[PDB]
């Protein structure tokens, strides 16, 4: 889905910035209604070839997904530099509204997180993992609802595999002791990653681990050490970080039963 640069309009002053680039707002002309839109630009004029072949694929990861809790593509436009268009979820990422927002409820913060295990869901289900699921590649559409986005380090897994094993530059504190120690990334990887977004955001967006050093997480981990419960964290989400931070892979457990864990209603 290539677009025309001439129906979109890009604001100057970015969103934020990354190691990669910008994210500008902008505006993108449709059939009939304009649509505001987040834009990834590329740093440099994206002569970095692995930095625009990690676009691509990030962009081929978004056109297959389609769920209301992941962010939209709309397309990819090549122009000055190259661009991922994307619907913009006006509120920004989580981390930094909880930083910015302290009185959010505790019941308005897990119905966010639930939001994000519904997605997550959904990509298990897909047979995708995304493997860089944080506080920050969460977006807020409204203060009570959130998707996700930043499918940079996503992958399609293989049929007959249930992990994506790498040949990396990783956010190795969100990542699960099979991805440090094996390189074996799994949905259950993602669960892991969770369980450091749920700690995140009943942190008010505070960092994981801070001041450690990623080689003292993994050893803090392997000693089974885990972080403590935020000031005024509910016992209950602390216990389900825990568990999502299940150093056993075949006993942590799947996001259809964290989703279950998360939802606020009574069900079966
Ligand atoms: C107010 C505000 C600020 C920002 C920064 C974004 C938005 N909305 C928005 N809506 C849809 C999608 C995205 C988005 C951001 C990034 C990304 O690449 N983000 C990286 C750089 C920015 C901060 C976090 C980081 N992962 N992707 C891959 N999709 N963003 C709104």
């Known amino acids: 889905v290539y677009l025309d640069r001439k129906l979109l309009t890009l604001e100057d002053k970015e969103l934020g910035s990354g190691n990669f680039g910008t994210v500008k707002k902008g505006y993108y002309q449709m059939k009939k209604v304009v649509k505001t839109v987040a834009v990834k630009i590329l740093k440099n004029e994206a002569n970095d070839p692995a930095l625009k072949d990690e676009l691509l694929a990030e962009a081929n990861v978004m056109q297959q997904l389609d769920n209301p809790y992941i962010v939209r593509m709309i ?147 392997e000693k089974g050490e885990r972080m403590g419960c935020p000031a005024g964290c509910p016992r209950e989400m602390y216990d389900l970080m825990n568990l999502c931070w299940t150093y056993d892979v075949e006993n942590r457990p799947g996001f259809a039963a964290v989703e279950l864990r998360l939802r606020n209603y009574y069900y079966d």
Request: glycine share 6%; aromatic share 14%; charged share 25%.
């Open 75 to 221: 397309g990819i436009c090549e122009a000055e530099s190259w661009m991922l268009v994307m619907e913009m979820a006006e509120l920004g990422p989580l981390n930094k509204y909880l930083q910015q927002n302290r009185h959010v409820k505790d019941k308005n913060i897990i119905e966010l997180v639930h939001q994000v295990s519904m997605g997550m869901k959904y990509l298990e289900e897909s047979n995708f993992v995304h493997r860089d699921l944080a506080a920050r590649n969460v977006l807020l559409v409204t203060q009570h609802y959130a998707k996700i986005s930043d499918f940079g380090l996503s992958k399609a897994l293989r049929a007959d595999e249930n992990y994506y094993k790498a040949q990396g530059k990783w956010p190795v504190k969100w990542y699960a002791p099979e991805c440090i120690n094996y390189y074996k990334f799994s949905s259950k990887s993602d669960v892991w990653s969770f369980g450091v977004l749920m700690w995140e955001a009943f942190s008010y967006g505070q960092k994981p681990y801070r001041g450690m050093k990623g080689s003292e997480v993994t050893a803090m981990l």
